[PDB]
C-alpha cells in the first residue's frame, strides 16, 4: 500500500498514517541521541553534542533549551523544527502563566504541545515538524517529571526515556537499570544517563562531547552543567564505578 502515503490525512486501508511514521523517521535523522532519567528528587537530560568543525561556535551549538525558569527541554531531530517547537513551548508557558497566575506544569505543557502537533497531523496545512521534545521539571506535588512530546500528539510520562538513533538501545539499557533499584540519587541518575549514552554509542565521553541539563527539588531551576561539572562527573564516576 503505497498510494496512501503522500498525504498526512489519508488512512491506509489498514488504518495507518505513513506520513506521521515518516515524521518519526525524520526524528531519527539528526544523528544525535538524547536520554532522560528521573531520580527521587531530580531529573537529568543528556544529549550527544557534535561540533564537527573548529569554526563552529560550540556555545551556540546546543539542544538543551530553558522553556521557562523551572522547565527544560532537550530537542532531537531537525534543528529548525526543534527551535520552532521550542519557541512554541516558551510561548505556551508564558501564556499559561499570564492567564492562570502560576507556572505551567510540565505535563500540561507537554499536553499543549502534543495537541498542537495532533492538529497538524489531522488537518493538511503543514507537515508534522519532525522533532522530539523531552521535557523535565519539578512539580510541587508529584516531584521530578520527565515527559516526551513526539510529533503525533503522544506525550506519555516517563521514568526514563531516550530519543534519536539509539532510542531502542537506550530504552533496553534503562529498562534493565530501572528494574533494579529505580530509586536513584542525583549522582546515580547522572551516572545512569551518561553510562546509557556511552554504552549505546560505544564510546567514552570527553567532557565536551556531551551536554547535560539538570533540575533538582532543592534547586528547581533548569541548570545546564558546565564543562568542569561534566568532567567532574565523568572522572569521579568512572573512577568509583
Amino acid at each position: 500500500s503505497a498510494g496512501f502515503d503522500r498525504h498526512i490525512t489519508i488512512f491506509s486501508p489498514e488504518g495507518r498514517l505513513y506520513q506521521v511514521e515518516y515524521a518519526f523517521k525524520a526524528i531519527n535523522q539528526g544523528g544525535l541521541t538524547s536520554v532522560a532519567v528521573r531520580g527521587k528528587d531530580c531529573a537529568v537530560i543528556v544529549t550527544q553534542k557534535k561540533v564537527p568543525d573548529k569554526l563552529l561556535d560550540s556555545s551556540t551549538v546546543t539542544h538543551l533549551f530553558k522553556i521557562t525558569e523551572n522547565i527544560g527541554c532537550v530537542m532531537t531531530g531537525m534543528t529548525a523544527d526543534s527551535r520552532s517547537q521550542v519557541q512554541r513551548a516558551r510561548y505556551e508557558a508564558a501564556n499559561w502563566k499570564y492567564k492562570y497566575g502560576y507556572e505551567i506544569p510540565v505535563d500540561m505543557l507537554c499536553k499543549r504541545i502534543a495537541d498542537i502537533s495532533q492538529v497538524y497531523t489531522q488537518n493538511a496545512e503543514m507537515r508534522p515538524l519532525g522533532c522530539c521534545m523531552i521535557l523535565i521539571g519539578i512539580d510541587e506535588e508529584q516531584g521530578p517529571q520527565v515527559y516526551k512530546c513526539d510529533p503525533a500528539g503522544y506525550y506519555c510520562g516517563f521514568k526514563a526515556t531516550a530519543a534519536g538513533v539509539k532510542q531502542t538501545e537506550s530504552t533496553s539499557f534503562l529498562e534493565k537499570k530501572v528494574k533494579k533499584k529505580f530509586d536513584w540519587t542525583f549522582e546515580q541518575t547522572v551516572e545512569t544517563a551518561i553510562t546509557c549514552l556511552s554504552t549505546v554509542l560505544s564510546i567514552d565521553f570527553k567532557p565536551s562531547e556531551i551536554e547535560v541539563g539538570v533540575v533538582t527539588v532543592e534547586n528547581p531551576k533548569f541548570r545546564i552543567l558546565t564543562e568542569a561539572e561534566i568532567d567532574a562527573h565523568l572522572v569521579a564516576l568512572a573512577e568509583r564505578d
Binding site: 567514552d204 565523568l234 568512572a238 573512577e239 564505578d241
Partner: protein, 132 residues
C-alpha cells in the same frame, strides 16, 4: 620519557626507605598527566613500575588495591593495561603462600573480567587458579 624513568628511580628509593602512599600518589598524578597527554609508553612504564614497587614492598592489601585502581581509572590505554597485567602475571607465577596468593589471583581475574585484549592472560590465570 627518559626524564620520567629517571625521576621514577628516586621514587623507588623513597618507597624502599618506606612510603605507604606518598610515592603512590605522586606516581598516580604523574600517570594522570601522561594519560591525559595520551602517552602510551609513559603510561605503560608508570603502571609496570608502580606494580613492581608494590611487589618489591610488602604490598599486602596495597598491590591489589593499586591494580584495581589503575584498571578502573579513566580510559586507560589498551597497551598500558596489557603491559601492566602481563608484568603482574609474570610476577604472580613467582609467588607462594597460596592462601594469600589466591587473593591476588582473584583481583587480577576481576580486573580482567573480560576484554578482547587480555583474553590469553586471563586464560593462563584461570589455569593457574584451577591447578591451585
Amino acid at each position: 620519557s627518559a626524564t620520567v624513568d629517571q625521576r621514577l628511580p628516586e621514587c623507588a628509593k623513597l618507597a624502599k626507605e618506606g612510603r605507604l602512599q606518598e610515592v603512590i600518589e605522586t606516581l598516580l598524578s604523574l600517570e594522570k598527566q601522561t594519560r591525559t597527554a595520551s602517552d602510551m609508553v609513559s603510561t605503560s612504564r608508570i603502571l609496570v613500575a608502580v606494580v613492581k614497587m608494590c611487589y618489591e614492598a610488602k604490598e599486602w592489601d596495597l598491590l591489589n588495591e593499586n591494580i584495581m585502581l589503575l584498571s578502573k581509572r579513566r580510559s586507560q590505554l589498551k597497551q598500558a593495561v596489557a603491559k601492566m597485567v602481563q608484568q603482574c602475571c609474570t610476577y604472580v607465577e613467582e609467588i607462594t603462600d597460596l592462601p594469600i596468593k589466591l587473593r591476588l589471583i582473584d583481583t587480577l581475574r576481576m580486573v580482567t573480567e573480560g576484554k578482547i585484549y587480555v583474553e590469553i592472560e586471563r586464560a593462563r590465570l584461570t589455569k593457574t587458579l584451577a591447578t591451585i
